[PDB]
Amino acid sequence: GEKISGDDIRNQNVLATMAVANVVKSSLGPVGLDKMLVDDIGDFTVTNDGATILSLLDVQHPAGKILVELAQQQDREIGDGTTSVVIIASELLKRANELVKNKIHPTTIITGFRVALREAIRFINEVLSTSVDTLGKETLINIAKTSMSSKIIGADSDFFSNMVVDALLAVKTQNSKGEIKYPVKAVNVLKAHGKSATESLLVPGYALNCTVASQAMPKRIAGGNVKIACLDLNLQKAREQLEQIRKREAGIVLERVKKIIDAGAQVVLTTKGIDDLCLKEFVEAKIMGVRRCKKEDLRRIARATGATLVSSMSNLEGEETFESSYLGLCDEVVQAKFSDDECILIKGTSKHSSSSIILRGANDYSLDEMERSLHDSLSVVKRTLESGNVVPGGGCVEAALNIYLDNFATTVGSREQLAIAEFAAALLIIPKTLAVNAAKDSSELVAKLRSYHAASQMAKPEVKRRSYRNYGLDLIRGKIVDEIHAGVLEPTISKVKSLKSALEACVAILRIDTMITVDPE
């Protein structure tokens, strides 16, 4: 079919790249703005998340879809910074275009970026810091403020700081051959409206959204040794031989409930609704029935309370029974009204302890953004506790590393130093884009910040304390502030994997030479 080769394809690759790059430019930084997407189904979705946009984004260019899969891999590896990482592919491929039109060979561009990022780890070793960082009184709050970038939660992040920290405090467990980590992605988030952001409650346990059929049951259980059972089977009314089968099936249901009553389970979790036959057995046995449960939420209950889901009741023989090993354990069961509904609160579980988060917002479009923003912050603390090395935030990292690459280019020399200079100018778009979203001047703070880092490497003792060297930048007032007063920092694993995952991503665009379009059937 259509076959077109030459340098026009690489010029078209960056043209389609810069076209979709404008999507994440306005959403970068705490002051970034959201954008509305039309789903053509009558509704719309307003999101600044690059992972959600690139998924729905329609790209008619074959190479433009590579950036879509790049954000998907960064969600499992990192889980945050979607618009603060992928955005570099705009100018990085644009500066390489000037080298393609010149006599620079693509391998020099490829090997130039590899030697730059390989030796960049030693440059990062200067800005690293331990997990203790300052004198304390703020520990996981400083890393919780990392999610302020690219998101609008920075205004309400004051009260939400202690909510995220305390949610991951009691979920501690032992895994990874004895390593102590927090099993994230297991936190339940409930959507609610009313009051304000400061009224958000943190539940140190499991929260279930359902409706209790009979209010006369022991809704609130006082004391320990609470047994909870889980059954995937549906016990209800279901299909003169028709009346005889109805009586035989009713006896089978009452027999299976009798096995649960004999086990002493205080809470019975069912997938579907409960008929009137099972409700009469629960009141006499002082058991609270639960209906309309989601299978995905029941999987976390099996790990938390310790109640394994029962697919079917059977054994090696033809006897049906419910074993006692499928019962869960917790400290107490408390039921309170949460947002025009009564939810079950399971706290103090035996096997594993979980946590639930209740959020408040304006509308459903606001809660969708507030949920994913705080959900991505859970991975920020998780990835930070894995590697104690941390780097300061504020965009001062990209401006500082580009100065060391200037003398590093003179060390290597030859033709590989020109690609290093172009790679240093490519990283300068990150601090300049933040100035555009902050309605400030671009080169104003960039030229000044690089002046403090220019003499940073020239200081022999570090003369007295730090006259020039410092970290952090103030986007609101457009001034250079210290990282201690600003209180902003970012994890190292997020910054290293940023350019590391983008390494093979940008080169893949450069490796494209001949473009061929086959006509569809």
Place this chain on the structure above:
Amino acid sequence: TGRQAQISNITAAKAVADVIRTCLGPKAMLKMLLDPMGGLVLTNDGHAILREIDVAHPAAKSMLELSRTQDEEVGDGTTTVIILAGEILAQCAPYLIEKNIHPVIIIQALKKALTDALEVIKQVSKPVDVENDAAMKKLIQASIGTKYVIHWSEKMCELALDAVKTVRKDLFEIDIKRYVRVEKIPGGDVLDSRVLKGVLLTNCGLFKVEMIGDEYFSFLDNCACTIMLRGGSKDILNEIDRNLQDAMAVARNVMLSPSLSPGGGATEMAVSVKLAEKAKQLEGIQQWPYQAVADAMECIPRTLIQNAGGDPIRLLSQLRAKHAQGNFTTGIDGDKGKIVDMVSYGIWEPEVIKQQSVKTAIESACLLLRVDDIVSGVRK
């Protein structure tokens, strides 16, 4: 695209707000709609207008969910609050697309505007005791003036005020008033009602069963209240619930906010003149977008002038001078477009009416400013 995409979003809410300008007050006008199917809907309520119309502008679709939130609280007179969200968008034309003002700077100015607005709301605060049945009677009759059930409300609104106080009481005073069960009986006279205190199905007085074509009568003595309504026509029961069941918001708002504000669009008159005075003390970059909010506040009372057939330029000259000099209790007569103050006008509205109006307006206005552009064709 970019700033050009926001211009289409401002005109989207501006075109919708201009339709509901005449939907406020007892003089409110009506609007006729023509669908591609050929059906016509003529009504003065903007609730069914936004639901039936399918707009091609993605920004106007967000106002449909906002109307559901405003109608969940009161629903009568709160539909025109969307105009305030549309006037702010049109107010940014000399700033956003001309001075290149950053949206967050405007949003930050709206945060100080929403905070200063609540202070002005507390300035017009006029508490009143809820123990007086005559004072609460004229309060629920405020929204009745837009209907012909005014003289019918004598035997109607008295049943609603007595039933809410039974299910309200205290706890704060927060309680659930949804336990009430209202039964509607078609046919008969509207003057015929049923006074029943108890649960409809110790030392009970009497037990009897009446004769009704719908169902029988049963009394349950407790140690909860129901309402049996007999309509004066067949389909009149739809309008009866709007003047009684939907009127329960007045009884809920007086318990949460006993204070009273000028009714009939007379509240924001003292707010606009006070907001301009609070702007002179700011003395900053944000002063211009902050002071320009008062220009959007005076557009709401112009709807009454457009309904009264007056000149909004010349009439508001003397009207704004009364609120900024004489007192903040002055108001505007919506019927004839007169300077008669709210003191002799006899109608007062709770503060929460304007609180939830401004709160939902600022929260909806900033979200529209946070949208850079709109794209289509994703094929989800």
Place this chain on the structure above:
Amino acid sequence: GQIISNINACVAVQEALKPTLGPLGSDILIVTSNQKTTISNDGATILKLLDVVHPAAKTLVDISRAQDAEVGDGTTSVTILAGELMKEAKPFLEEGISSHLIMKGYRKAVSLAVEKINELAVDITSEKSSGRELLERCARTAMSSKLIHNNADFFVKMCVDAVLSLDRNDLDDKLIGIKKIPGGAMEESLFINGVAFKKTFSYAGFEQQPKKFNNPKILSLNVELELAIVDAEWQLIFEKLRQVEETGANIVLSKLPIGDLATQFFADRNIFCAGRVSADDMNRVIQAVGGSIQSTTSDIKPEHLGTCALFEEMQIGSERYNLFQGCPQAKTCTLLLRGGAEQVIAEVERSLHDAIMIVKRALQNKLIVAGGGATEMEVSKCLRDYSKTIAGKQQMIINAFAKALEVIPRQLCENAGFDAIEILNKLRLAHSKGEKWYGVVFETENIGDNFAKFVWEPALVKINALNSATEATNLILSVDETITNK
């Protein structure tokens, strides 16, 4: 935004002149509606015949036309700098940087550049090179920096001896005009000490013309000589011929042609006469022989008749021309080009006229600096250290102008086939740890010292180059809109 669209159309102007930089440069062929073939390296003739679309293209033409007064040569290495300053300034114009900071920062960079150029220019005088040396040894490669590579050795021993007769403080460009003689050789051109012009018309006594004069006298007369009516018209012309003989003029220059009566009268007396004399040739004789032009025979007097040492009739290219020698006042030496190719005559015509500009500025001040594009490298090296502390954002602005001067060594490597990166690494150490004067050497194809290479260039070329590129680049930034009626 409107300036960017105007720059891209002006980029192709010097990109067509891109290979033309350096002595290895190429030429541009131009064919007009008259089918006149013009092949020359100089962009002044190129931009004059180049079709312009946007008015910004005329800006480079006005600077190129004024370049003859400021410098006159090296136009390939000057005009290209006007487009390079606006090429790297595109990312700055797209950002919040205004074009005023680029224009204001440019004058601050030129003020520091000219200060260093005057520092690089050193005048020893004293016992070092003097006349006939600086104009030969140091001007060997300085006179022609582009063309005449094979014939350079011929003109150093010829053209230098012609410009030696030109004394300082005079610098007359009216007497340096050349002529076009078909046929012959370039190195065989004869030196002419007096006025020489073409006959342009053939005579029946062309072979009978007098060979030489011992004491010739040139007289300029505008009287038209052309023939009862027959006796009257013949007598009036005869009386005018007798009045001319009273002055004793052996050479009579007539503006309008003469008939047979005036020719036969002058042939019998062995009196020379030449018709169809142009007005430009008459002013050349006034500044050489010192005669005068008489309109009629009323005011003609014997003292208006000038004289010269001797006259000679030269025959070259199968055609004879008038040759004057030993004029009373001659400030230059007339040169006559030769060769059979018309393009070659016009090729060296632009080059020799550009070489006299060096002699003009050398007599005022004698100065030489390192040539071969090494001047901008030392200036760009100094601007990198100063601009860091100068007025905030001006660091990145001057560094853009510092990197804009890097186009000169990149162009010299494009023609020679070298590497653009390899020369920058060698010069960076040569202009920092290697002090200054180390340049680039094309002959040995490596980096060497221009002091021992004998190749130098006047620093006055680079001084006016920045001034010529000042208002040229500032006008592009100062114009944000262009309107064309109809």
Place this chain on the structure above:
Amino acid sequence: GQIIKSIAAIRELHQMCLTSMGPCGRNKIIVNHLGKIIITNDAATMLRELDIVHPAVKVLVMATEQQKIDMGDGTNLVMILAGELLNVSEKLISMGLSAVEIIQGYNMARKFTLKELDEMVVGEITDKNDKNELLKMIKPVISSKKYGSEDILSELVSEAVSHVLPVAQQAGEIPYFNVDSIRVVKIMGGSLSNSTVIKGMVFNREPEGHVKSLSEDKKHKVAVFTAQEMLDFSKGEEKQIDAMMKEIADMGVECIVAGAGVGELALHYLNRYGILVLKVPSKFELRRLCRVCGATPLPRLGAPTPEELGLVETVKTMEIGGDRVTVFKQEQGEISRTSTIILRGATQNNLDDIERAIDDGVAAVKGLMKPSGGKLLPGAGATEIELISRITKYGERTPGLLQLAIKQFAVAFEVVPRTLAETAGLDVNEVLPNLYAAHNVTEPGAVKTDHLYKGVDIDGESDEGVKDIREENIYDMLATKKFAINVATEAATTVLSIDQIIMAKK
């Protein structure tokens, strides 16, 4: 069909002249049907060469003639002010306000502005002949006119005005100011440092026959003027021309001025008798020649009257810009005023902007001499911020419908400080609070506080925003501002008065 249509053309031209004014201002290129390229920042010259197909917006085009005749400067300020008044009035039109109160609002505020100009005036200092006073007037023009070099151009004009100065110290009551007394010549090539001033006037012509000086003659004399039968006319003219040219040489007249067609026989005798002649003098050169020299252009071809003749103390025909040129150069002692200033530049378009800048400098002296005085006003946009506080106060003093017109009249003043920020690329919102920081809440008890004393000068001080205008000598012309608000109000109300376009037989 008119308002919205005109504003579309107004916002176009208003944005065009917005970047013209100011030291950071920009120029434009205009190409006519003949291909002539002109680069200038002047709005009057701009709209003159441009072809506009919208008759409604042409009101602002013809309104420039009122400003050029009265003053000739501040043309960019009038187009920005008049264009902004119609832009801010668009909001009042959408509100339903009739043009009655809009026209009355601008006319009521116009009289209030004239009352403030007399109260806010400073820096009398009243000195005509000081060389520093000539520098204080010519320096501020770098905003509207060419800002390229104010050091050299200010010195040449100050020496030229002082050279043509009538003197007559104390009270001389000097009428008949000479606008033509200043002339510049465009010379291609060279830099501005090569430019100088000559005590006499110069012009571009070339000598032919003599080129000799002849000014060493110690009060020389100059005159000014307004088949045998075939030789009867030939010999008849040779005898008459010889006798007429001999009597002129007998009187000792070295140079003559011939304003008519000169034949070949006339130039023949001029070379023998050594008499210089001028070739085809133009209309404006003929008037300047007879007034300065004081000789009568006698049309008679014979001997002129020796009693009345021209005189030039010192004149040289040698090279000036590299070519021999005969000029009128003279000395103030024995002959009258109207000297010249020679300019040197590589670009001919830059010499045109300097010519228009110097021509506007002549009006600065006209504004001082013709009325009682030109006074002074705060420059660099510092005058408009002083009026904003005054006009805002008048809105509360006069309650009524004019408050809507007074409000938009004060907001329209924001374009002047925005001009400095827009042309410099800086954010106007950052400089805006620095402009209000001068007056703060109210004015301090001291006289001439930082509001009146200082001003807005942005070079490295953009962070501070305020700078002293006294040391910088940045001021605005009072006669220009009085005429600016008059033309802007007359042009704004004219557009609002337009009803329908009428075409008659076309």
